[PDB]
Every structure is written in structure tokens, then in C-alpha cells.
């Protein structure tokens, strides 16, 4: 879990670089996973309903 928020994996085509996010960006980038997750529970309900 933790690590990847601060220091991501950026694969640009054929090259991969680890580099740099921030404080507002960790409590953006965790959602992030809660961007996918919230909008997929939203979409899960949209489907279900």
C-alpha cells in the first residue's frame, strides 16, 4: 500500500521512471484508488439499480 503514493512507477512507452508526488498529492493520489473505487461503487449501484 503506502509507498507508491509518494513515489510512483511511470512507464513511458519503453522506459520506466520512479519520481515524486507531494502532501496534497498523497491525499489526492490515494483516491486514486478511491477514484476508481468510489466511482465503481457508484457505477456498481447504477448497474444494480
Amino acid at each position: 500500500l503506502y509507498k507508491n503514493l509518494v513515489k510512483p512507477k511511470i512507464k513511458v512507452g519503453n522506459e520506466m521512471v520512479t519520481q515524486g508526488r507531494n502532501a496534497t498529492q498523497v491525499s489526492y493520489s490515494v483516491g486514486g484508488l478511491a477514484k476508481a473505487m468510489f466511482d465503481r461503487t457508484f457505477k456498481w449501484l447504477v448497474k444494480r439499480l
Binding site: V12, G13, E15, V17, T18, Q19
Partner: protein, 156 residues
């Protein structure tokens, strides 16, 4: 293609963030010289100005967005140098097959042609030597300490 790895991006960030003396995130075009040098790419001032650099101070300022398309160009150079070129080169002094070099004769070659060193830097290059009169250095320990750097095993 080539592009900068996570480790390399950290090397480039650290040094740049150090060079921000102002508090705005920028480097001078003069300071482009020793910045790349600390980044460990070894260039001529000719290589520095080739990518937008200055003799003078107070000319142009470059961001990291500018600086990285400098550094990712610089990495292409192949002819950096080895040891053995320098051996072959510094052997030419000989006259009697001794590999030994008199002090005046050795300061003068450092001063005269090239990007050049000063009077002052020659006083420093001599500093490590002690207690040999009329007055001989030697080609092999000399070159090896240059490539070894400021702290091989000992270091002052």
C-alpha cells in the same frame, strides 16, 4: 529512444534544488557548468555553451523543464577518456626512459594550452607533494590520483 530513470530523475532533482540559491527554482546559464559536472558528466565549456550557457554571470535563467532537455541531450557523449590515453600522452616528455617529471616543466604544461588552469590551481596541485628537491614527480602515481579523486584512501 532514451529518457531519464527514477534514480536519474532523483540525481537531477537533488542537485538542481541545491543550486536554487534564490528561492525561485532557477539556475543561471553560467552555473550550468559545474551543475552538470556534479551530475558527473564531464564536459568542456564548449559542451556547456553548446546547450545555452554563459561566460558571464547574469545572462539567462533556465527552469528544470529547460535543464532536463539539456541533461538528456548531454548523456549521448561517448568520448569521455580512459587512463591509457593519458599514459601514452604523458610519456612524450621523456628523454632518457625515466617516467620522471621536473616541477617547473610540469606546472607549465598545465597553464598554457586548453581551457587552462591558473597560477593558483598549480600551487594547489603541488600541495600534496612534500620533501623532494631539484625536483621530481612521476607520471604513474600522478595520473592514478587524478582518476582516484580527492579521497582515494587518504584524503586532505
Amino acid at each position: 529512444m532514451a529518457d531519464l530513470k527514477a534514480a536519474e530523475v532523483e540525481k537531477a532533482r537533488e542537485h538542481f534544488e541545491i543550486y536554487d540559491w534564490e528561492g525561485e527554482g532557477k539556475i543561471d546559464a553560467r552555473d550550468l557548468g559545474d551543475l552538470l559536472r556534479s551530475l558527473d558528466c564531464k564536459p568542456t565549456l564548449a559542451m556547456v555553451k553548446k546547450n545555452g550557457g554563459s561566460d558571464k554571470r547574469g545572462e539567462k535563467k533556465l527552469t528544470l523543464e529547460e535543464f532536463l532537455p539539456i541533461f538528456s541531450q548531454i548523456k549521448k557523449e561517448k568520448e569521455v577518456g580512459t587512463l591509457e590515453d593519458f599514459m601514452e600522452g604523458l610519456k612524450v616528455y621523456d628523454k632518457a626512459e625515466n617516467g620522471t617529471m621536473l616541477a617547473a616543466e610540469l606546472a607549465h604544461v598545465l597553464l598554457s594550452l586548453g581551457e587552462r588552469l591558473t597560477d593558483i590551481e598549480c600551487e594547489e596541485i603541488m600541495r600534496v607533494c612534500d620533501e623532494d628537491d631539484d625536483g621530481f614527480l612521476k607520471y604513474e602515481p600522478f595520473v592514478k590520483t587524478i582518476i582516484a579523486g580527492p579521497f582515494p584512501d587518504e584524503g586532505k
